[PDB]
Every structure is written in C-alpha cells, then in structure tokens.
C-alpha cells in the first residue's frame, strides 16, 4: 500500500499573548511537528512585526525543518480561531510555494496588532491566541 499524507492542519495556541513583549523582528517558534508516512515543520510568529514595513503587524510563517529530498512544494492557509471556535482573518497562499530545508514562507502583515487588541474579547479569549495553519503538500 503506497500512501502519503497530502494535507494536514496544525493548531497552535499562544497563552498570555499580551505578555509577549518581543520587539520588532524578534520571533516565537512553535514546537516542531511532522507530517506523516518524513517532513518536519514549525511555525514562527513575530508578535511585533518582522520589520518596519510590518511594525504594526504580527508576522506569520511556516518553516520546513526537514525533508527527504531537495525540496517540498506546498499551499498553505493561516487563520485565527475566535472565541466561538470559528475561523476568521484567513489568508492563503494563492499558489504552492517551494520550501527547502530551513526556509519559510508566510505573511509579513497577517493581522494588525491594534485590531487584535481591540477585539481581545473575541480574538484573545483568556488572553490566548489560537492560530490555525492548513497545509497542502503537493510534492515531496
């Protein structure tokens, strides 16, 4: 039986998000997670932007930690799960992107910090930020 894990969704919750005082360009890595049957990945968020261009934004990235071959091609979608558990503020890679070991792809301006704070009741229940990343692996 020749099989492959072609799709997977990773949910990541960052507690006491308001306590995350990392400055522009500082990052928060999630633990590394694998997809199955080979590939290792992790998420990276910049609470206060990666750079000036994104100073008022939270930056979100998908990193390919390891792959058996030279590269991996994949489509991805990032979103936030709200208080009611529903998806919101979704952004998706239009096409698939070419990942290689140690390289990431994502959105530099995924969502504005002031918006996240203003809607804290809904987007930061108990001051917890829950991120959702759905990936589509098209080539291994």
């Amino acid at each position: 039986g020749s099989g492959k894990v072609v799709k997977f969704s990773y949910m990541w919750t960052i507690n006491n998000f308001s306590f995350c005082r990392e400055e522009m360009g500082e990052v928060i890595k999630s633990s590394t997670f694998s997809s199955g049957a080979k590939l290792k990945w992790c998420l990276r968020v910049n609470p206060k932007g990666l750079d000036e261009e994104s100073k008022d934004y939270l930056s979100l990235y998908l990193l390919l930690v390891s792959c058996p071959k030279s590269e991996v091609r994949a489509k991805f979608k990032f979103s936030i799960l709200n208080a009611k558990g529903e998806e919101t503020k979704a952004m998706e890679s239009q096409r698939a992107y070419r990942f290689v070991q140690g390289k990431d792809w994502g959105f530099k301006k995924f969502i504005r910090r002031d918006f996240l704070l203003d809607e804290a009741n809904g987007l930061l229940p108990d001051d917890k930020l829950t991120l959702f990343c759905e990936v589509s692996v098209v080539q291994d």
Partner: peptide, 8 residues
C-alpha cells in the same frame, strides 16, 4: 500575492 520569507 504578497507571501514572503523571513529566513531567506
């Protein structure tokens, strides 16, 4: 569009 890398 506007998907970018923070590693590369």
């Amino acid at each position: 569009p506007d998907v970018s890398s923070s590693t590369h």
